[PDB]
Amino acid sequence: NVIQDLYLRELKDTKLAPSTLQDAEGNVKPWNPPQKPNLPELELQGPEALKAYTEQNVETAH
Amino acid sequence: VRYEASLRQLEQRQLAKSVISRVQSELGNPKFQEKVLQQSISEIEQLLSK
Amino acid sequence: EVSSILEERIKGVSDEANLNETGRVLAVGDGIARVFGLNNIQAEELVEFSSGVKGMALNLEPGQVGIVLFGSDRLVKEGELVKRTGNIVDVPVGPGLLGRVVDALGNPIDGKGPIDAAGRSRAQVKAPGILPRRSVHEPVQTGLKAVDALVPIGRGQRELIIGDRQTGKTAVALDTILNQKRWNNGSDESKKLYCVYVAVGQKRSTVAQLVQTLEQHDAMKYSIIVAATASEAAPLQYLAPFTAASIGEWFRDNGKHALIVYDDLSKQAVAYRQLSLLLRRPPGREAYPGDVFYLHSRLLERAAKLSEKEGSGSLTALPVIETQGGDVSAYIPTNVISITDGQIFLEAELFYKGIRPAINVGLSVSRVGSAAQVKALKQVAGSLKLFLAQYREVAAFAQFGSDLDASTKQTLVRGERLTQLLKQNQYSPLATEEQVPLIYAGVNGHLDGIELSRIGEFESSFLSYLKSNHNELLTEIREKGELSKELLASLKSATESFVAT
Amino acid sequence: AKSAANKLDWAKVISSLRITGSTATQLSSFKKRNDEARRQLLELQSQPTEVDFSHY
Amino acid sequence: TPITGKVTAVIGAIVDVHFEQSELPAILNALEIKTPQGKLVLEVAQHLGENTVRTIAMDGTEGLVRGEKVLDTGGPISVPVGRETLGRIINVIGEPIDERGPIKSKLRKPIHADPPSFAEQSTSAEILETGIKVVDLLAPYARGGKIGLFGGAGVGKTVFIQELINNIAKAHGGFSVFTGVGERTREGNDLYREMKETGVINLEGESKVALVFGQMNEPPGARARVALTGLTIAEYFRDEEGQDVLLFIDNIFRFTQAGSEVSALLGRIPSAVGYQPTLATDMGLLQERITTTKKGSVTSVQAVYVPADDLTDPAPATTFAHLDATTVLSRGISELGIYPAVDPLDSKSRLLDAAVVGQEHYDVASKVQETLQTYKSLQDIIAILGMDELSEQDKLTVERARKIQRFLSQPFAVAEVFTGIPGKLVRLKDTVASFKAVLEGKYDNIPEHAFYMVGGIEDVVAKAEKLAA
């Protein structure tokens, strides 16, 4: 009765629809896709080090 | 998702204040008179059914 | 949207009431209303005050029936009409309470949607009789080796966790809940304990941390959390254990085994005190109303190992009482001590001493004894009790620091190592199948030799070693649950082998 | 796999003990242990490489 | 609402009004009796029926004439909130008692406000380091937490809070609320002056702090709702501004105490020790209106005047329940001359864990606790017979512990006047290191006096040299 009237009038006559994405963007974390951080490189290329290590390292006792 | 859920709650409390506005409208009208008559006759039917 | 359906439901509640009982509020204040009228009124009835406040009714007087509000009186006002619900207080009880935090009236306060309820029940339900009870014979392993060894937990037993304020007080209990993950995850329904943690008087933040901890260990998938935060009404707090009990009874009734932790009853007593003194009931002993013993006893006696004709049901209870200043002669602690079947005294000094979990083994008893202790674990820990008792006596003499004889120092040396053996890391219970070896080693004195400092290292390593080699043996300890001659020999050899690491 | 590599690694640590010198052997072992332990923790860390476009 | 009444009774500051019309204000509505002392604000607390409410009076009631006209202001007292509060000292009513005239009001909010829900809770995990060694070592604080202090009030208790304000609140920045329930007026004036001096209040500019002050001269009833008022100011920051705040409460014993005074007059059967039966509820409600919601995180500091320094007293006991960390400060440790006087075996935090502050910190703390507990254990034996009659092994422990005890004193810059020693703040990273070394006895070879009243390990080393000369 009064319930119905209140229900009918309020519900019918008051309609909402969700807010714009732009406003939403403000309230959320936006995200710009992560890049590739690093491209690895050759592992100590050149026998300069290698020759040094082969000759230098021995450390054997008598 | 978090803002979406928040927005549903926000919509509900916004629409709640519209209920308050509507409440003031109903109690202003001679619906204030006419629905009292409806309630009155409803009590007649109900209490007579007792 | 969701709003349109909700409004439709709201429109869908109409239909006049005939209000067969009315009464007018008059004296209202302190949250305790008193209404004049209500000629028909059941005792303990729930009455809806016209203001959307519901209050149970605890005093019926030939003037004014005293209806204790479950809400705040800032929504109540003088001369309101009250309409009797016509139902004595009741809660939804069901399987859906698993994985849900619920407030006293069964509203999900974690808001994981409406509770899937298979029934409703009533707050007061009489305790299981002598006839429908069968003797306890089902272990419950808390994964705290000291607890399992010294004060074994079974099903249908009530054992009181008592000790100084929040000395990780909640955490001692929480460990038990956590170790029940091992069986619970398991599909053995005859070893399924559904766990109900009841939190009375704690702040929302404390509760929230706890439920989070439970979610972290992913144990909330078998937990029911009944909560009554400190904000919530003193009547609701008073009603809170009793409605937890009924929730437990649904499990118990189904025959499914369960365990209910009632943490802390000490705040129930404060609540009942407030309630009684504003029901103007004559002040009881130590200001706690004199019928608190009855209140607590009826609550506690509803956990039991029901008979085999009653499908071997068993709600198990663990009450938790905070002792204010460790006063064990205080009326509320004294009352509870009598009711329960065990004491699990926690001592602050030993906590500070770094014995965590902290248990004063002299003030800890299990009057329901080793009928619920694992048979294997009984064999290994057989003289553990004697050793510890000897250690206590020896330690007292040792304080005087008189030149101790070798016999006293055999005890002293053994005892020191045992104490270090007992210690365990909080929030990390250990599997019983792998606690039996550790106790074997200690009791068979292999650790007595091993230096005190590296006992902790040894323990870790020993487990790794048994995992490496004697994992066949570990499987057997789990599987056969009694150490046979072969197991005893295997275990003896393993320990001996690991003496020198 | 990673365990094969590491079994040879630890076997050689106790072998390098056997013969004289081992002054820089353990440093080789250390580099290998470090990064081998990093990739296993990485591989266990591995989240789904895409959002839930089904569920979420 | 304009509801005339007459004053039926004036039993203490618990006036009873008898409304003559059948429109009756609800409980927690507010009434103004206008007098040549201006308005007196009273708050409905019981309805005693027959159109006779009984109201707590939040202002002094001397001079009232029975039957005096009352008018009902209606609803809970509405304070004024905003950022305009920052740079004001406000009375219980909300009057600007720092006399910067009318506060520019935005929203005026009811004093009583229901505590946020279980769902709204958000659990903390932040480390907040104060640079106070004893705090850092024993029980680290956290942002959003509820911090707790116990002992004699303003016997060093007030000073401790002042040190906390000095350290935490400049680093924190943003909104901060100081609410002082029943504090010594002169001490409050000192705080006001000091705050203005340290620019936190800059009255020429803007102030990022707001102040609520309730003097201990204020009537008991007034003191009861000083707290609720402050919490509202905090809520505006917590919720509406949504920026992390700070909150100081000193003493929350005064909140309980005030309630106990009014309780008797109100007509309640006294509970044990004499405390109000609504002690549990009132404390509970208050302490759940101070919390870290998902809306905002409010670090709160609560100061408990323990009466007679008996923790077993029910009001301090129920306070201990609602705190997230406590650092009970003991008169005995004060007698030992250690300022800060925090008892080291009676401190706890849920933030002291081997996950939260890592195993190394936890290990360091474990050893400190064990050492000190041993030292406490041997106190009997020490008194009855000499320390030389203790075991040699124990004598090392005792010597170490005596050093640890002395080491724990950290001069405070706020107490610089009193100590006469320039204060020092030591890093959390530094603290763990300093204690670690001492525990390994590295620097144990230099006098106890060297460790006495000085800062970090490096300072101790230097102070040994100072003594050596």
Swiss-Prot record, chain A:
GO terms for biological process: cristae formation; mitochondrial proton-transporting ATP synthase complex assembly; proton motive force-driven ATP synthesis; proton transmembrane transport. GO terms for cellular component: mitochondrial inner membrane; mitochondrion; proton-transporting ATP synthase complex. Its main location: mitochondrion. Keywords: ATP synthesis, CF(0), Hydrogen ion transport, Ion transport, Membrane, Mitochondrion, Mitochondrion inner membrane, Transit peptide, Transport. The keyword Isomerase does not apply. Coiled coil: none annotated. It comes from the Eukaryota. It is found in: Mitochondrion; Mitochondrion inner membrane. Mitochondrial membrane ATP synthase (F(1)F(0) ATP synthase or Complex V) produces ATP from ADP in the presence of a proton gradient across the membrane which is generated by electron transport complexes of the respiratory chain. F-type ATPases consist of two structural domains, F(1) - containing the extramembraneous catalytic core and F(0) - containing the membrane proton channel, linked together by a central stalk and a peripheral stalk. During catalysis, ATP synthesis in the catalytic domain of F(1) is coupled via a rotary mechanism of the central stalk subunits to proton translocation. Belongs to the ATPase h subunit family. Present with 6140 molecules/cell in log phase SD medium. This is ATP synthase subunit H, mitochondrial. It comes from Saccharomyces cerevisiae (strain ATCC 204508 / S288c) (Baker's yeast).
Swiss-Prot record, chain B:
It is found in: Mitochondrion; Mitochondrion inner membrane. Present with 12900 molecules/cell in log phase SD medium. Mitochondrial membrane ATP synthase (F(1)F(0) ATP synthase or Complex V) produces ATP from ADP in the presence of a proton gradient across the membrane which is generated by electron transport complexes of the respiratory chain. F-type ATPases consist of two structural domains, F(1) - containing the extramembraneous catalytic core, and F(0) - containing the membrane proton channel, linked together by a central stalk and a peripheral stalk. During catalysis, ATP synthesis in the catalytic domain of F(1) is coupled via a rotary mechanism of the central stalk subunits to proton translocation. F-type ATPases have 2 components, CF(1) - the catalytic core - and CF(0) - the membrane proton channel. In yeast, the dimeric form of ATP synthase consists of 17 polypeptides: alpha, beta, gamma, delta, epsilon, 4 (B), 5 (OSCP), 6 (A), 8, 9 (C), d, E (Tim11), f, g, h, i/j and k. Belongs to the eukaryotic ATPase B chain family. This is ATP synthase subunit 4, mitochondrial. It comes from Saccharomyces cerevisiae (strain ATCC 204508 / S288c). The lineage of its organism: Eukaryota, Fungi, Dikarya, Ascomycota, Saccharomycotina.
Curated annotation (Swiss-Prot), chain C:
Gene3D superfamilies: 2.40.30.20, ATP synthase alpha/beta chain, C-terminal domain, P-loop containing nucleotide triphosphate hydrolases. InterPro entries: ATP_synth_asu-like_sf, ATP_synth_asu_C, ATP_synth_asu_C_sf, ATP_synth_F1_a_nt-bd_dom, ATP_synth_F1_asu, ATPase_a/bsu_AS, ATPase_F1/V1/A1_a/bsu_N, ATPase_F1/V1/A1_a/bsu_N_sf. NCBIfam families: atpA, PRK13343.1. Changing G248D: In ATP1-2; growth-defect. GO terms for cellular component: cytosol; mitochondrial inner membrane; mitochondrial intermembrane space; mitochondrial nucleoid; mitochondrion; proton-transporting ATP synthase complex. It is found in: Mitochondrion inner membrane. One of its GO terms (molecular function) is ATP binding. The modification Phosphoserine is found at S14, S135. Its main location: mitochondrion. F-type ATPases have 2 components, CF(1) - the catalytic core - and CF(0) - the membrane proton channel. CF(1) has five subunits: alpha(3), beta(3), gamma(1), delta(1), epsilon(1). CF(0) has three main subunits: a, b and c. ATP binds at G163, D164, R165, Q166, T167, G168, K169, T170. The keyword Ion transport applies. Keywords: ATP synthesis, ATP-binding, CF(1), Hydrogen ion transport, Ion transport, Membrane, Mitochondrion, Mitochondrion inner membrane, Nucleotide-binding, Phosphoprotein, Transit peptide, Transport. Changing T340I: In ATP1-1; growth-defect. Disulfide bonds: none annotated. The record marks S364 as: Required for activity. Belongs to the ATPase alpha/beta chains family. The keyword Phosphoprotein applies. Present with 41500 molecules/cell in log phase SD medium. One of its GO terms (biological process) is proton motive force-driven ATP synthesis. This is ATP synthase subunit alpha, mitochondrial. Signal peptide: none annotated.
UniProtKB/Swiss-Prot annotation, chain E:
SUPFAM superfamilies: C-terminal domain of alpha and beta subunits of F1 ATP synthase, N-terminal domain of alpha and beta subunits of F1 ATP synthase, P-loop containing nucleoside triphosphate hydrolases. InterPro entries: AAA+_ATPase, ATP-synt_VA_C, ATP_synth_F1_bsu, ATPase_a/bsu_AS, ATPase_alpha/beta_chains, ATPase_F1/V1/A1_a/bsu_N, ATPase_F1/V1/A1_a/bsu_N_sf, ATPase_F1/V1/A1_a/bsu_nucl-bd. Its EC number is 7.1.2.2. The modification Phosphothreonine is found at T73, T198. GO terms for biological process: proton motive force-driven ATP synthesis; proton motive force-driven mitochondrial ATP synthesis. GO terms for cellular component: cytosol; mitochondrial inner membrane; mitochondrial intermembrane space; mitochondrion; proton-transporting ATP synthase complex. Its main location: mitochondrion. The keyword ATP-binding applies. It is found in: Mitochondrion; Mitochondrion inner membrane. Gene3D superfamilies: 2.40.10.170, Bovine Mitochondrial F1-atpase, Atp Synthase Beta Chain, Chain D, domain 3, P-loop containing nucleotide triphosphate hydrolases. ATP binds at G151, G152, A153, G154, V155, G156, K157, T158. The modification Phosphoserine is found at S334. Belongs to the ATPase alpha/beta chains family. F-type ATPases have 2 components, CF(1) - the catalytic core - and CF(0) - the membrane proton channel. CF(1) has five subunits: alpha(3), beta(3), gamma(1), delta(1), epsilon(1). CF(0) has three main subunits: a, b and c. Present with 164000 molecules/cell in log phase SD medium. This is ATP synthase subunit beta, mitochondrial. The gene is ATP2.
